[PDB]
Amino acid sequence: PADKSMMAAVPEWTITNLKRVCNAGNTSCTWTFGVDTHLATATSCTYVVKANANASQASGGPVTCGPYTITSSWSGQFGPNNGFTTFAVTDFSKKLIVWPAYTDVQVQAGKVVSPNQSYAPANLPLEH
Amino acid sequence: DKSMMAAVPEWTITNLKRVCNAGNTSCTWTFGVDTHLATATSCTYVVKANANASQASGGPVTCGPYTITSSWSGQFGPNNGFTTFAVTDFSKKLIVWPAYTDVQVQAGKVVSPNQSYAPANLPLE
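Output (structure tokens, whole complex):
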């Protein structure tokens, strides 16, 4: 059969008010953001990543926020100036997943990312 | 508020296949990346680990214009383990995340149908 688009026929999920707050020693980074699917009222998420060092680079999760299972990994593959975090936000019940990705520059000041960034959910053919 | 999805065709991961050695210390992923606007790129993507290379985080590996990493997650239990690739065209600042359950790739068989993913913009500098 034809190539299968994995993009769901749903509105893009908007990640709202995304901010990273890391403690003094960068052993705990707290990500706060909303998942706004528009089809439902937005889910507010507190996503804490801990590590012995460089929590801002550490892989995090799985953390459950509302219907979502959230992980995150950081990549310096393009150099430390071009480091970026990729969240994996999965609604298990809907079998939908998005990958919000934020460069360190966007989040380094601990200031909100604006505008809010929206991503097209992909189907993930999990088997219930 | 601002869509990060690029206004280009979805990229198709063609003939995605995972082959792991006997001890699962090395899994070789083979696939093509077809943007449909340029010649497809053939990719060989080897993940090695002391154990469970099929669960190991891979990359970065370069295949043509793409920098590829991969992450595996058992957050939904072993039955619903799935691998997420991060395929980034750094020059275009475009990235897709082809995601395949272990069910889809366990046979070492080619994933069919091929699966297409909408690239997102990655605002690198």
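Residues 74 and 81 of chain B are 5 Å apart (CA to CA).
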